[PDB]
Amino acid sequence: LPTAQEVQGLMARYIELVDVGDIEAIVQMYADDATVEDPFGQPPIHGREQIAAFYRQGLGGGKVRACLTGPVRASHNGCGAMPFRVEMVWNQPCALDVIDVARFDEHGRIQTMQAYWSEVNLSV
């Protein structure tokens, strides 16, 4: 599994990809059969096609900004967690505070992603 330093780099690179909205590059960061639970509590979506559709819906159709709002917290077992803020228009300018928890596989790809947030974390 990716080292703690590597996890930091990868999770930071995920945020940068969300920030520019490069759907294909985001999807490539995931394992081919990865799961996404976003928001955590909802049923997982499975596989790169479903994940691509998810990101197309959520990012496509307008400017989205995303910045880390604190450092990535990495483990020594290929996992990490990070706090960030996503700015969008829905549907005025709003911001959502999120924490992503990720588990990576032996190939450095995201196997599971869990995005913790609820409506309390949204601001118009």
From Swiss-Prot:
Annotated catalytic residues: Y14, D38
GO molecular function, one term: steroid Delta-isomerase activity
Record note on what altering D100 to A/L does: Reduces activity 100-fold. Reduces activity 10000-fold
Inducers of expression: By steroids.
InterPro entries attached to this UniProt entry: Ketosteroid_isomerase, NTF2-like_dom_sf, SnoaL-like
Effect recorded for L122A: Slightly reduces activity and reduces protein stability
Effect the entry attributes to changing D100N: Reduces activity 4-fold. Reduces activity 10000-fold
Principal EC category: isomerase
Effect after changing V124A: Slightly reduces activity and reduces protein stability
Annotated EC: 5.3.3.1
Positions bound to substrate: D100
Result of altering Y30S: Reduces activity 4-fold
Gene3D superfamilies registered for this protein in UniProt: 3.10.450.50
CDD domains: ketosteroid_isomerase
Keywords for the protein's UniProt record, in alphabetical order: Isomerase, Lipid metabolism, Steroid metabolism
Any GO BP annotation: steroid metabolic process
Known partners and oligomeric status: Homodimer.
Identification of the protein by name: Steroid Delta-isomerase
Species in which this protein is naturally found: Pseudomonas putida (Arthrobacter siderocapsulatus)
